[PDB]
């Protein structure tokens, strides 16, 4: 991913295939402007549980993880991106996509797997030690089975930012 | 005479003349007696050389210059920083 300019007036970029950007940590919070097309092909893969380096037109390489995106309401199209500069040793709370594996023994009788929490906030993970997903096996589940947060296998060192009695995956009855 | 009702329900005339608000502002010269605020409760409370009438009206005790102190809503004060 290759950035270009950085003015306060976005009039120059708006007409072209460019999206406004920002990257911060606590020591450097510079202005930015990258390619729409290039950002999309990459972001669609990465999201909050992935990172890429941004080399601004002057030879300055920095690693950054996406914090928040803001798209147009009338369009689907993103109009601005908030990148957060990575430390190397200790990060923040990250939203991880909760996924499902194997057909349930509850989905058979007339049930359906309801992923109540689409993205999970996880305390103390580790930078570049961020899991790109969060797979949860559901074969053990019958109709009326609620899988809480304090029942999920996290990958080494990671802790949970949400309550342990809070429903993440449930098998739902018919009608 | 009917068995229905006295005054007919579901109305929409009724309202009242009414006034209110600030009269003299931050950086105005005032003579003694000059009303600087008309209000309901104690939006603004009295300060230096500022009195408070029966109807919470804020008036000048002594001539000078109106000064507003905004501590953060509720803690609102009008004062007179005497010119001399």
């Amino acid at each position: 991913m290759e950035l270009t300019a950085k003015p306060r007036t976005p009039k120059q970029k708006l007409d072209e295939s460019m999206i406004a950007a920002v990257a911060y940590n606590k020591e450097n919070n510079v202005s930015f402007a990258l390619d729409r097309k290039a950002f999309d092909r990459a972001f669609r893969q990465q999201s909050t549980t992935g990172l890429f380096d941004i080399t601004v037109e002057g030879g300055e390489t920095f690693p950054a993880l996406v914090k928040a995106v803001q798209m147009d309401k009338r369009k689907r199209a993103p109009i601005h991106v908030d990148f957060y500069m990575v430390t190397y040793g200790e990060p923040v709370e990250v939203s991880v996509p909760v996924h499902t594996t194997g057909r349930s023994q509850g989905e058979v009788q007339g049930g359906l797997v309801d992923i109540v929490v689409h993205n999970l906030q996880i305390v103390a993970p580790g930078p570049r030690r961020i899991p790109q997903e969060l797979v949860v096996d559901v074969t053990k589940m019958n109709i009326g089975d609620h899988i809480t947060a304090g029942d999920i296998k996290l990958p080494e060192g990671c802790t949970l930012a949400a309550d342990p009695e809070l429903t993440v995956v449930s098998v739902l009855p018919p009608r | 005479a009917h068995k229905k009702g006295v005054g007919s329900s579901k109305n929409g005339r009724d309202s009242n003349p009414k006034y209110l608000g600030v009269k003299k502002f931050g950086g105005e010269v005032v003579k003694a007696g000059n009303i600087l605020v008309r209000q309901r409760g104690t939006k603004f409370k009295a300060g230096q050389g500022v009195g408070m009438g029966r109807d919470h009206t804020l008036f000048a005790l002594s001539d000078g210059k109106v000064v507003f102190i905004n501590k953060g809503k509720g803690a609102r004060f009008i004062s007179i920083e005497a010119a001399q």
């Binding site: 669609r44 009338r74 309801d114 | -």
Partner: protein, 136 residues
């Protein structure tokens, strides 16, 4: 449909969607491209359309609710006062607002149930997917 407790009457004004995400609750959604007043009966019409298509289960999220009361002309006049409490309830929908979202159904199954529900609506709509995680 209608609301349980209230005030009786209202007004009218418009400008671009305030509180409508993309992917909350469901996997696929149905978004407005035009502003309108969604009648209680049009939502009910859309719901039944989707519910019938997805025979058993129940995974339809109606993110819009009719809360605005609209009025009427008894038959003639104007030589009287403000009118008709009980005409119809409405949901002020502005472009961007997710009206409906489905779960536990395929891309193809959802494509259709929304294509059907679209024909019952007084505005143009667009079918959507995931990649919106704003604030939770």
């Amino acid at each position: 449909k209608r609301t349980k407790f209230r005030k009786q009457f209202r007004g009218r004004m418009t400008g671009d969607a305030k509180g409508g995400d993309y992917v909350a609750f469901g996997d696929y959604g149905l978004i407005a491209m035009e502003p309108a007043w969604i009648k209680s009966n049009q939502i009910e019409a859309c719901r039944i359309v989707m519910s019938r298509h997805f025979r058993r289960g129940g995974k339809i999220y109606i993110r819009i609710f009719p809360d605005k009361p609209v009025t009427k002309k008894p038959a003639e006049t104007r030589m009287g006062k403000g009118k008709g409490a009980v005409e119809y309830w409405v949901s002020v929908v502005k472009p961007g607002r997710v009206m409906f979202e489905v779960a536990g159904v395929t891309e193809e199954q959802a494509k259709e149930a929304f294509r059907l529900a679209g024909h019952k609506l007084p505005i143009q709509t667009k079918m959507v997917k995931r990649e919106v995680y704003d604030e939770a």
